[PDB]
């Protein structure tokens, strides 16, 4: 399950990163 895990966790972390990026960049607008 080498390849399965590696290039499924790649897009897994894609989703995770976009998730946290938006959840960090919204309260920015709130206090702004």
């Amino acid at each position: 399950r080498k390849n399965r895990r590696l290039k499924q966790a790649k897009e897994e972390a894609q989703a995770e990163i976009e998730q946290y990026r938006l959840q960090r960049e919204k309260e920015f607008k709130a206090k702004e």
Binding site: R1, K2, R5, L6, Q8, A9, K10, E12, A13, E16, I17, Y20, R21, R24, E25, F28
Partner: peptide, 24 residues
Amino acid sequence: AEEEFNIEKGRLVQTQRLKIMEYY
């Protein structure tokens, strides 16, 4: 199998959380 994606998530999560924190 497990370790591969384990440290994969670790590395990419860290190296992107650092960036987004610095930016914001």
